[PDB]
Design a protein around this ligand. Structure first.
Ligand SMILES: Cc1cc2nc3c(=O)[nH]c(=O)nc-3n(C[C@H](O)[C@H](O)[C@H](O)COP(=O)(O)O)c2cc1C
Ligand SMILES: Cc1cc2nc3c(=O)[nH]c(=O)nc-3n(C[C@H](O)[C@H](O)[C@H](O)COP(=O)(O)O)c2cc1C
Ligand SMILES: Nc1ncnc2c1ncn2[C@@H]1O[C@H](COP(=O)(O)OP(=O)(O)OP(=O)(O)O)[C@@H](O)[C@H]1O
Ligand SMILES: Nc1ncnc2c1ncn2[C@@H]1O[C@H](COP(=O)(O)OP(=O)(O)OP(=O)(O)O)[C@@H](O)[C@H]1O
Lengths: 364, 364
């Protein structure tokens, strides 16, 4: 009609997408045409797999929810789109997105099917990794948050509880030189008061290390990889708010010794902090840069042109619970600073020439 | 090469996927064939859009990154796959996935292109909302974890600190009827000891309500909608780990009064907990069901066939910090029960007949 059928077949033959045509034979949907893209996608030759049902690509994996959906859609004659785990000739696993359209041929009085097949292995794998990274980030966020919470309340209670015990020791000394008949009752009451104060010390340390159970070591980590992993989580919104991203990396300064989950959470917090500071900024530029620093250490810098720092803010930063945000907890930077220094580096902040914020840290 | 080109054209014509053929004319890739699927996808008639470049679907939206990728891929003759913001005839926006394959016809000495076009508007939208839900979950996880923590250490310290103040009041009472010369010194020391206890009392509530700032809003919420949002986060792996999902919902008993972020986080925890319990299970079945239930309420049930509960476990459940997991906090169920009861319902647990766990809650 619009185009020669010979040309249309030529396009299908050379399409980069897997395209097959199948023929209904009872409970079989036997292949009657496959294009070279389908031969590459599946690793099979056309002369081998023709005139049998495509379900052989599943091989052994039959507990897939999409299989029943396809069978019902074929039984109803309606099209369908499902993702299945298929296996190529060499046995390698790929996820195959099947777009199947049942078509009825009047000339044959027979039912055919056209299937467009696309490899979504790369989509499934990066998505599955993001769910790992999302659950990993949530887990370490909750653990470290209560960790900073526990050390904060412990240190802030350290002074009043110690004062209580000091007043007990002083009162007991005053009561030592006493002959009053009620003195032993007072001394016993002061004893139990001292015990309860010490027990409060026991309690806070007990619930502190209940959320600190499970701690890690360090390993060789690629900065490129962890910057990309942290960016996938923390920088997902740059395009919608027009933040210009620049990752300036040093190939000579790419491998560091770091525990990947702690540096991930530092960068996620820095990335999110930077996006928030640039919400109302006219210039929106985020730069990440690595250089060797200290004496045979390596420094990573993340600078923004965001809302920046008032004169009083910078020295109140990296301090537990300090925040300028209505809903901020002010623990992100405090946890981050402790993490970088525990890795053998230093972490600090400064205003940049554009009125924004610059954070630096070093890693070995 | 295996089927008649007329039959192959018949399949392309009736494919549920948009399939077009274009012809290179300098910097133009003019349409020479579109199938009815593309006419429905684009809302245009074939007689209208033939023999012009498909770029009219972009309209004015030319600040799309895929346009440069497609233009260069066409210039190089290599295939490409990009998603673009296109607008149909009525002006409504849809996201279009373009698989373009440049093909060379020797008979013409001309370059053609075959394009498979599918509407991915829903995929892009559910993914963008999923990115929102992930950041939303991280935010409230850290907030609520320190929130249930703030009440936790306060409740465990409530007894020793109250005892300290009571022993101060009792000691002062004993010292009232005393003539010993050192008594006024003792009384003054006991006063400051009591003051430090009260100051420690202030401290825990102060650091408690620093994380209680954003805590107290409610709203009308759809259970169907929030179950799907929670499922997107918590149940993302059911298909890939072969968990059978069944949501048996009643549309007449679907709308409840609930604060959506807190119930979402309750469900996310239940969904992840259920997947973990079925990690080593031979039968993997997850059932979510809503029914009318109480004198004013509607009940939602989440049942699994997972590892279930040892005989001693259930009575320590819904209790803060009780966990059977090496890395667990044991606050999820505790936070969940407080959230559901604050929303006017009740929450409890029981073992099911398959050896797994069943959780129920009700909402108005
Ligand atoms: C045109 C067409 C193409 C198909 N391609 C594939 C495929 O590439 N991989 C696959 O695992 N199943 C594929 N299937 C699905 C199988 O043909 C089969 O219908 C499905 O596994 C469910 O059928 P069953 O319930 O009889 O197993 C395709 C089906 C049709 C109609
Ligand atoms: C076969 C084919 C189909 C195309 N279909 C679409 C389409 O449906 N929507 C769209 O926005 N662009 C589509 N394009 C892309 C445009 O034709 C154009 O190449 C693109 O906008 C980049 O070229 P330009 O930089 O000259 O605009 C298609 C291209 C080809 C070759
Ligand atoms: N990129 C930045 N630009 C400007 N100010 C920043 C930037 N990053 C952090 N800050 C400042 O640091 C303060 C503390 O931030 P921090 O990361 O510790 O926590 P937060 O963002 O307030 O809260 P939360 O713990 O919920 O993430 C913020 O209130 C803000 O004033
Ligand atoms: N669906 C379930 N099947 C079996 N056991 C479960 C299920 N849901 C919860 N549990 C049990 O309840 C215990 C407490 O769970 P809870 O939700 O309070 O926290 P958690 O999963 O241990 O930790 P976190 O709060 O960090 O997620 C778990 O250790 C687990 O043994």
């Amino acid at each position: 009609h619009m185009i020669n059928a010979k040309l249309l077949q030529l396009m299908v033959e050379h399409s980069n997408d897997g395209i097959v045509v199948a023929e209904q034979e009872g409970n079989e949907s036997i292949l009657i045409y496959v294009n070279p893209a389908f031969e590459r996608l599946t690793g099979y030759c056309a002369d081998d797999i023709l005139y049998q049902d495509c379900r052989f690509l599943q091989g052994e994996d039959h507990d897939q929810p999409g299989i029943a959906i396809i069978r019902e859609a074929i039984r109803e004659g309606r099209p369908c789109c499902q993702v299945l785990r298929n296996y190529r000739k060499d046995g390698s696993l790929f996820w195959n997105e099947l777009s199947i359209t049942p078509v009825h041929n009047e000339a044959d009085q027979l039912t055919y099917y056209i299937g467009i097949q696309r490899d979504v292995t790369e989509h499934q794998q990066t998505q599955a990794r993001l769910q790992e990274l999302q659950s990993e980030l949530v887990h370490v966020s909750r653990l470290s948050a209560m960790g900073e919470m526990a050390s904060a309340l412990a240190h802030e209670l350290n002074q009043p509880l110690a004062a209580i015990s000091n007043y007990m020791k002083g009162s007991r000394r005053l009561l030592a030189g006493s002959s009053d008949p009620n003195t032993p009752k007072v001394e016993s009451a002061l004893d139990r008061a001292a015990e309860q104060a010490l027990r409060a010390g026991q309690i806070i340390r007990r619930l502190r290390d209940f959320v600190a159970r499970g701690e890690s070591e360090k390993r060789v980590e690629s900065l490129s990889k962890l910057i990309e992993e942290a960016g996938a989580l923390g920088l997902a919104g740059a395009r919608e708010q027009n933040v210009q991203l620049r990752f300036s990396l040093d190939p000579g300064a790419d491998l560091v010794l770091a525990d990947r989950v702690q540096i991930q959470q530092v960068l996620v917090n820095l990335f999110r902090n930077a996006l928030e500071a640039m919400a109302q900024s006219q210039r929106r530029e985020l730069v990440v840069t690595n250089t060797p620093a200290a004496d045979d250490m390596i420094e990573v810098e993340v600078s923004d042109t965001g809302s920046g720092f008032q004169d009083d803010v910078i020295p109140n930063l990296f301090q537990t619970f300090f925040t300028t945000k209505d809903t901020g907890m002010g623990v992100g930077l405090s946890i981050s600073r402790s993490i970088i220094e525990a890795h053998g580096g230093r972490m600090w902040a400064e205003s940049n020439a554009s009125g924004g914020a610059t954070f630096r840290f070093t890693l070995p």
